[PDB]
Design a protein around this ligand. Structure first.
Ligand code: 1BU
Length: 261
């Protein structure tokens, strides 16, 4: 029905990448010459007009640090098609074989890029709701992009949101501070040892994560700004973008590598 439409025959589906309840995600081939990621709808497990609100949104929100919609087969079976990210989810990349070698300069660069994707989302006055590593894709050359896999994540969610349902670009910012610990511990779970009910209790009373081992203090301070009790006092993604981009000159000019960061 719109120019995003393509025929179900231009697609050679190849390797499975796992199932959610609504369908499957496949690596594959568009016009025999393009690496794509194809998302599935199992018919009857849900309606088109809901399964395709994703593609709908991915048509509005287009940006170099956001995941890229390519095309739709919006007639059953229904397919959504986007660019293929050759290193998968950022969470698997940080805990896997690749995380042995990632140092603070690549990690902050990743950070700078997700921030930049998020700067666009702020600008577009849209709200993410589930910023965290499991939702960032990594591509060739440590290229990161904000995605949503439709994965409660209270460990990543700002109080005002987990409690009262006040999700905003500012709760997205809290989540960013949590992402900064993921990047700086190679994707370890935030708040190790606490269980959800104690995170709510503990963060309510002002408890905040300490400096990760080897993380510079000024990055911890940035995490802390991200986690202010007061939504409006947390910084913009635009600020976050710039401060990160500029890190190794303005903020940590004497940075030296160590064993892990
Ligand atoms: C559920 C829903 C509903 C409404 C909107 C969304 N949004 N929202 C966004 C924002 C706001 C960030 C633009 C993005 C989405 N949707 C989305 O990210 N969908 C999506 C993206 C990539 C994939 N899968 C893979 N793709 C590209 N390489 C891979 C490489 C490895 C791998 N394992 C999976 C993949 C599946 C679904 C999501």
């Amino acid at each position: 029905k719109d120019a995003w439409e393509i025929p179900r025959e231009s697609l050679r589906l190849e390797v499975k990448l796992g199932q959610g309840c609504f369908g499957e995600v496949w690596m594959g081939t568009w016009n025999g010459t393009t690496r794509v990621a194809i998302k599935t709808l199992k018919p009857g497990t849900m309606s088109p007009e809901a399964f395709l609100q994703e593609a709908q949104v991915m048509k509005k929100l287009r940006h170099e640090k956001l995941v890229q919609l390519y095309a739709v087969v919006s007639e059953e079976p229904i397919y959504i098609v986007m660019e293929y990210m050759s290193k998968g989810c950022l969470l698997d990349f940080l805990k896997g074989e690749m995380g042995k070698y990632l140092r603070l300069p690549q990690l902050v660069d990743m950070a700078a890029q997700i921030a930049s994707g998020m700067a666009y989302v702020e600008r577009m006055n849209y709200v993410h709701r589930d910023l965290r590593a499991a939702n960032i894709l990594v591509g060739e050359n440590l290229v990161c992009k904000v995605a949503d896999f439709g994965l409660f994540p209270i460990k990543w969610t700002a109080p005002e949101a987990a409690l009262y349902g006040r999700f905003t670009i500012k709760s997205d910012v809290w989540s960013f501070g949590i992402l900064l610990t993921e990047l700086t511990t190679k994707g370890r779970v935030p708040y190790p040892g606490m269980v959800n009910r104690e995170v709510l209790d503990q963060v309510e009373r002002g408890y905040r994560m300490p400096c990760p081992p080897e993380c510079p203090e000024s990055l911890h301070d940035l995490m802390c700004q991200c986690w202010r009790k007061d939504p409006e006092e947390r910084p913009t993604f635009e600020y976050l973008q710039a401060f990160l981009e500029d890190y190794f000159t303005s903020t940590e000019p004497q940075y030296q590598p160590g064993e892990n960061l």
